[PDB]
Scaffold this active site. Sequence first.
Site, mmCIF file in Angstrom:
data_model
loop_
_atom_site.group_PDB
_atom_site.id
_atom_site.type_symbol
_atom_site.label_atom_id
_atom_site.label_comp_id
_atom_site.label_asym_id
_atom_site.label_seq_id
_atom_site.Cartn_x
_atom_site.Cartn_y
_atom_site.Cartn_z
ATOM 1 N N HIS B 128 19.847 60.641 -0.740
ATOM 2 C CA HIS B 128 19.848 62.085 -0.997
ATOM 3 C C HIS B 128 19.537 62.859 0.272
ATOM 4 O O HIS B 128 18.520 62.619 0.919
ATOM 5 C CB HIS B 128 18.857 62.461 -2.101
ATOM 6 C CG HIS B 128 19.365 62.201 -3.484
ATOM 7 N ND1 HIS B 128 19.613 60.934 -3.963
ATOM 8 C CD2 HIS B 128 19.679 63.050 -4.493
ATOM 9 C CE1 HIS B 128 20.057 61.011 -5.204
ATOM 10 N NE2 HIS B 128 20.106 62.286 -5.550
ATOM 11 N N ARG B 407 27.194 55.419 -9.408
ATOM 12 C CA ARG B 407 27.074 56.624 -10.226
ATOM 13 C C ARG B 407 28.274 57.561 -10.085
ATOM 14 O O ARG B 407 28.705 57.867 -8.977
ATOM 15 C CB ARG B 407 25.776 57.377 -9.925
ATOM 16 C CG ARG B 407 25.466 58.478 -10.936
ATOM 17 C CD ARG B 407 24.220 59.258 -10.589
ATOM 18 N NE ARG B 407 24.402 60.030 -9.366
ATOM 19 C CZ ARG B 407 23.642 61.057 -9.000
ATOM 20 N NH1 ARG B 407 22.636 61.454 -9.771
ATOM 21 N NH2 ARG B 407 23.892 61.691 -7.860
ATOM 22 N N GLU B 517 21.125 65.156 -17.182
ATOM 23 C CA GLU B 517 20.629 65.987 -16.087
ATOM 24 C C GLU B 517 20.193 67.368 -16.550
ATOM 25 O O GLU B 517 19.328 67.982 -15.941
ATOM 26 C CB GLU B 517 21.704 66.143 -15.008
ATOM 27 C CG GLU B 517 21.584 65.190 -13.835
ATOM 28 C CD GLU B 517 22.881 65.080 -13.041
ATOM 29 O OE1 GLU B 517 23.931 64.798 -13.655
ATOM 30 O OE2 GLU B 517 22.853 65.278 -11.805
ATOM 31 N N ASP B 554 18.295 68.367 -11.388
ATOM 32 C CA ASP B 554 19.231 69.297 -12.001
ATOM 33 C C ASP B 554 18.739 69.913 -13.322
ATOM 34 O O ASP B 554 19.351 70.851 -13.829
ATOM 35 C CB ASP B 554 20.607 68.626 -12.160
ATOM 36 C CG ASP B 554 21.445 68.664 -10.869
ATOM 37 O OD1 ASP B 554 21.638 69.772 -10.317
ATOM 38 O OD2 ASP B 554 21.920 67.595 -10.409
ATOM 39 N N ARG B 592 13.507 61.339 -9.566
ATOM 40 C CA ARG B 592 12.538 62.288 -9.048
ATOM 41 C C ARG B 592 12.892 62.860 -7.666
ATOM 42 O O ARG B 592 13.831 63.642 -7.538
ATOM 43 C CB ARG B 592 11.143 61.674 -9.088
ATOM 44 C CG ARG B 592 10.648 61.411 -10.501
ATOM 45 C CD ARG B 592 9.168 61.174 -10.486
ATOM 46 N NE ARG B 592 8.501 61.727 -11.655
ATOM 47 C CZ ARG B 592 8.205 61.021 -12.735
ATOM 48 N NH1 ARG B 592 8.532 59.733 -12.786
ATOM 49 N NH2 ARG B 592 7.586 61.601 -13.754
ATOM 50 N N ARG B 724 24.229 72.149 -5.311
ATOM 51 C CA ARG B 724 23.388 71.006 -5.666
ATOM 52 C C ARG B 724 21.897 71.349 -5.601
ATOM 53 O O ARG B 724 21.489 72.246 -4.865
ATOM 54 C CB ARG B 724 23.710 69.811 -4.764
ATOM 55 C CG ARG B 724 25.202 69.622 -4.486
ATOM 56 C CD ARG B 724 25.965 69.038 -5.674
ATOM 57 N NE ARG B 724 25.830 67.587 -5.770
ATOM 58 C CZ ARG B 724 25.121 66.962 -6.702
ATOM 59 N NH1 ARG B 724 24.481 67.657 -7.635
ATOM 60 N NH2 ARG B 724 25.055 65.637 -6.703
#
Lengths: 918, 918
Positions: B128, B407, B517, B554, B592, B724
């Site tokens: 991320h 994913r 999400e 999200d 998280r 995002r």
Amino acid sequence: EYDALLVDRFLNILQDLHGPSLREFVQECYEVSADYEGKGDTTKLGELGAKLTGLAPADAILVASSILHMLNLANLAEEVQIAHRRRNSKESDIEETLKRLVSEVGKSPEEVFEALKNQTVDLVFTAHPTQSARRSLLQKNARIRNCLTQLNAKDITDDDKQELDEALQREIQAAFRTDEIRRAQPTPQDEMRYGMSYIHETVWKGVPKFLRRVDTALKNIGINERLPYNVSLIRFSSWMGGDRDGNPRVTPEVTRDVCLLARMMAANLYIDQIEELMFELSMWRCNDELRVRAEELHSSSGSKVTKYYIEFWKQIPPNEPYRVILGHVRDKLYNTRERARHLLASGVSEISAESSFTSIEEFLEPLELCYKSLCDCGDKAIADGSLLDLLRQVFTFGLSLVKLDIRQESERHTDVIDAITTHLGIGSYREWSEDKRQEWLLSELRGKRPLLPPDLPQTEEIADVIGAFHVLAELPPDSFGPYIISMATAPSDVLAVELLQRECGVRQPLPVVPLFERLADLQSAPASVERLFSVDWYMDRIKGKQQVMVGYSDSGKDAGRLSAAWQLYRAQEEMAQVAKRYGVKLTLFHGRGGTVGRGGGPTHLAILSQPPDTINGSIRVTVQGEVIEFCFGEEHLCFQTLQRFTAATLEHGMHPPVSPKPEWRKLMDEMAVVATEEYRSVVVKEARFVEYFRSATPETEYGRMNIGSRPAKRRPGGGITTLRAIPWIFSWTQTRFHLPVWLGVGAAFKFAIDKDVRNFQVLKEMYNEWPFFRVTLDLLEMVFAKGDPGIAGLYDELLVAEELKPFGKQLRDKYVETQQLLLQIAGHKDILEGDPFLKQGLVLRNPYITTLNVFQAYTLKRIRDPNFKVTPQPPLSKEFADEAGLVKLNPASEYPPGLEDTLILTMKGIAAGMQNTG
Amino acid sequence: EYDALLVDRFLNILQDLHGPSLREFVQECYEVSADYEGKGDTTKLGELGAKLTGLAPADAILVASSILHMLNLANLAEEVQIAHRRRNSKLSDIEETLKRLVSEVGKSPEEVFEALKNQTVDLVFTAHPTQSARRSLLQKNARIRNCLTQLNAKDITDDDKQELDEALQREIQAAFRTDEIRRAQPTPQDEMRYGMSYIHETVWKGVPKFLRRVDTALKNIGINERLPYNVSLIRFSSWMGGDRDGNPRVTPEVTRDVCLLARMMAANLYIDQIEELMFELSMWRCNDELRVRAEELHSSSGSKVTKYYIEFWKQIPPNEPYRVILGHVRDKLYNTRERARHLLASGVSEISAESSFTSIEEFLEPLELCYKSLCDCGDKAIADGSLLDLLRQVFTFGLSLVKLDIRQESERHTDVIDAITTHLGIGSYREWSEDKRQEWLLSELRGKRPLLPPDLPQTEEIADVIGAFHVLAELPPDSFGPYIISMATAPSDVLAVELLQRECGVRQPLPVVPLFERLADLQSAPASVERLFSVDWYMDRIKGKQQVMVGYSDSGKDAGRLSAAWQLYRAQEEMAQVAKRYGVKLTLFHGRGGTVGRGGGPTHLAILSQPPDTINGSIRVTVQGEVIEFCFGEEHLCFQTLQRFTAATLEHGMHPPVSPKPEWRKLMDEMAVVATEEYRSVVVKEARFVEYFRSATPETEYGRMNIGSRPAKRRPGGGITTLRAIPWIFSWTQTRFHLPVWLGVGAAFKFAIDKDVRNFQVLKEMYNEWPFFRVTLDLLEMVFAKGDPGIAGLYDELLVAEELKPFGKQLRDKYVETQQLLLQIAGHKDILEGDPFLKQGLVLRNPYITTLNVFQAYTLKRIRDPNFKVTPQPPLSKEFADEAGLVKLNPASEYPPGLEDTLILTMKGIAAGMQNTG
């Protein structure tokens, strides 16, 4: 408290694994030998061997193995505490020695700084067969010490402690459950890899750390700059692969093998360093010369040097200049390592000359370019980090990591040259007188005409000699050191090599150093050196520089210990005078061993005991066998050892010891003759000596340890005269008599005081005022403290023939007489007075060495005399109950079941207790 | 004390490289900012804005760089002072947690033991985009921390301290003279190696160490047993190369590269370990099974595996059985890492399947044989040594090191299934209702006939979906974890993937987990789960094991902090109950991350805040991007991080938090609605909000840091809805307003106490007693204590249009009303009143964060407004006198010279000051 920690943990493991009985036996053995230690009762020893003899073959080995590991753990627990006591200090180090030379000696820092820049100590690792230790076990020591050191840290969890304790437990048990015996001699290549592992694990990283210390020490006395990185304050060389003296298994191929293996190791060490440096040197600011080079290399993607590491080449950013230069350096290094591997596997590589690093200059160019770049950008701080450390490695280690010294017997060159002058119908070079040889040799050296005929018939020995020069001629000169001549007597020997070297096509010859190893040769030595220096050809050859070696091993074997140490003194002293007269810079190569009787003893004292003005920033000393482990076994040990050689050499140069008064001189000259006479009266002028020798000491069994690759008897025929120096000292060390170490000293002392009672006050004045004399006696005191003639009498009782038994008693009488006088002169009432801890250390260590001494004496008897039968006891190990797998570790032994392993273990263990093999 | 050491040294260096005037300037900014800090005078900020705006392009950067580095050095010193304080509090953890669960909770040590055997915590490394720091800078952090740690040790010499200091000096200056800005977006494979460096450098050695502590802690509660080496008490998975959601740059090929690269890395680590282990296990005692195999391998010269390491086989002596088996194990490993190399570098390899390790059971076969041998011979103590640590690595890491989670978006699979139903003319899958989708999918899943036509027309997106499945079809199954569906809504999504997976030939399919999400999905979530159970096909597929992911990022974006956090609570709670009723083991994967606004916070508290009986020794958690350095940056950190997860999860299983009282529940439901509406009334139901957002925060400039491979918007259309969660949270974190973190919480509290004043005595009663409620309010408090609405007001001034400005001031009134209402319920008068050290740190840090807040706002102004006038100053850097090589480090910036690099350094700097990117 440290040894109570290790011995107690071992015993629990012994019991846990073998049953309480055996653990009681090993403990009972301690107290029976401690009653001998306590009161002196000789009847104890007989009673102890009564027990040991009857043991099972499996239990016998077990007991002998156990005493070995306890004696070893006693050593580790001492090393740890020695290290702890030194650390808790906050003989001398490098920063103190600078501050002293400035304060007390009144020297200027710029003089001390100048002295430093000119200094170079060269430690030469050799493979002298004095290390019974399998490396596997050595590594286990380092962990045991490490578990022990941390365990006794100040701040530490109960959990951290509890787990370090578990770690220490299993480490000890791992060592105990490994076969401590080497089951086949190493090859010379093994010997070399074995010793290089120290260069790798401690010396490599540990050199720049000592050097940065020297920087710090320089700053504390006002010097505002670092020791310039091109200074080789300390260097490293090797005999591992080069010394073939009395070792035929070191063949011309072995020398080539080692030479290339070294280059391999080196390149791989550098590749690792360069790679870490590329991660660090991320800075973008570079000077002009580097930017240009970095932009050539960037566009060409390495200048097309590798195609391996090509992934790295495309994705490297442009504004990372240093990474590009080093990226190139590392691509080149991979080639160098790979070209060596191919030259070793085939003799030819596809990889070219200028696709790799060939010279030390080639390799330094980009590195220094980075340094000056970083300086020119004001980032000299950044530069003096990992970059500085690397540069210092390159000057200290170069491309072959360690230079190789080549050493061959003197008379071997004679045989070649005589084969030449015989084939050529000129006569027999062997039969000519020395002055004629020189005249002939000198004609040839000046001459322009080839000598060595290709059709020359050769013995295998003449083959090996020429074939050695051949291998020397094809390998890069920067991989070698000098060519050393064992048994070097007269200038013929040196010139004979200079010739053979040239006539075998060694395009750039190795400087020729003689090794004066014997008494006559050390006397004639300065006379030898002056003749060479006076020759116009030889003088142009050496160009202001001459190195010469002096052997401490075979010296003391020729004369006594006293006579040899004195002759070695004045042979240095005089040669330095001749050299000074001819303006030649003499560099003394010291053939020092580990044991006292081969030039052993503390490093700073050994230097201090050498004649003043005969060092001056230039000295080479051998580091032999186990001594590498003693000096470079641990990070701190390596650092400490570099400290001793460097700080001593420095002081000795600027602040030399006192030259011996003429009083002292004459008395040393006179005593040495008496001492030699007395020594040789025992070892040479006595037919029945060699029979008593091979009987009273475990001499003939030394080869069974499979220590080194060298057959340690120069020739079966024959006598003591051909027995190498190492098994010699070893033999008298096991028995704890130390004959060659003190023989002749007593007589020389007795002579001097009987000649004139005034001399007692002269001997006393020398021991107080004269470093050489003091160190020599002090070292003798240590030996006697490790001596028990009662043990020597025990070998004499069980193994010596009856007629000779009084000869033995005669010798022990000299032992006691010598010790007695020694102490008086030193002004000591007791032995090891004025030294704690090393006397304490001998208190727990002794009863085990006594147990082994007893064990070995009986184990020797059992082997020699089939008639000495003893009633076999019941088994003690729960492991070996009924009909023995451990004994089967020795497939085919020349001796009855478990007798050879029991013996070897007794030897290994006693050597550990003495903290010396030979 | 620790920060004063570092900050001062940087300044000396800053003055040393760029002159005094610059140093004083940076110091001026501090006290200017400090004046604001201690009084609140909003005029000082504007005052400073004058100074910072006039700076030369070279000096504008140098200042931003200097604030950054000092800000980082302050973070560094705090990390070292935290570690120090922790070690002092051991002169909670895992050994305490075991004891407490026995004494206090009253569990049997056997029950505790058993629950550990059944525990497994799966930490998921993800890429991320939150790590601004270049890895070359991070490495330098480590050295700085170390040099700072050794500097303040108890036992240390004067010179040791002097050099450690010199080492600290150059290490700071090194980081300072490095370009801090990543000049190019990483590749997903760059990102993956980046993450794997943590696995290599701390996690590899650190797992076996942590488990050995669990051993000891087990023994401290009297277990007398080691946690069996087959227990994976902690496991590591990766998204780096698998997570495709909103990142088209993660191609099927990326996933393939990552899968092989990992197996290469894994073998290469197992090789280094095995080689050490061979050195160690030099024992000769072995049991019959090992002896047999040992002789087979020995006599066959390796059993024909590699021909590499052939020099080692000839070397191998007979009675070293462990080295024999292990040697073959190594040979076979070399093949495994090579075969991966050739499988990576080209289509296939010469090296066969059964010449290397294919299965983890094949790799464990010989290792376990060794372990049983050593135990059988009574050397289990040796067996528990280095061997035990390896075995535990084999069970913990396998042959691929880490498992890859795939994913993909929910609708992206819909697109594929709609392309098939359209092509086959079955209909439009997209237009079908949910119950029809389920009915059709289940017909297909029960059916034996193929579906997917090979002549299917595909868009590029559709070819990335099907091509991805194709990759999973090929690679060995044990390299993947699950297949994760982002934006999971109904059971159709799960069945859709189950079908596509089979119809793409993935022979042994990945288990399908839905990622809920958003709020609406988390509400339907337990119903979806029950629907997916009760399907006789899906029940036989999962075989009692179902995993589901809950998204903390999200969620808060969709609903707001409080309403998210609460729906997340009962999402897990009810899914548990459904699973429990169906006889299904629900494993919860928590998504998280770093910031509090994404489920951030202390590990042991987060786990405490999770509903009772929804963990039971089975859990997965994301360790996102920069959080990996927060947890696994150092050895001590890695150990401490496995500690929290293992101790919190164990305790939570056997000693749960309390269930909320019905009164509390109802109040939460009611407050959730109110918070959601208030939060959505701002970010959704306000036309001009999106204009205000991209105006008052540097949201749009996020992409200039080149953090991730992923573009930070899921394509332009949509507005705020497609931005995002990470650059979202980042935006308000820079401005120090933290909008999404606290918006709605004020309105939810106000509602509760106004609906009935009695609720104030409830809201406190909850904070004092309820672990969930308390952790959320505390984590809010920390946020507000890192919050300054006066800064948010400074951005509103220089940037926000005049019409939108009062809207901004309306929000700031919500900020204060919320922080006020928070403290009243927490029983705190001041902010961070209960935290003395975290409050201290924000005292020295804040004036630098403030200085960068001012610098950023004005720098944003100069970009957006070219009509903004400012008078230039003279050059402050002695390095850049006349017309600048530093500003040329930017190739071709879209902004004026030095404006981008200044804007970036203000973001990275502020990011370090908040200790969070986003």
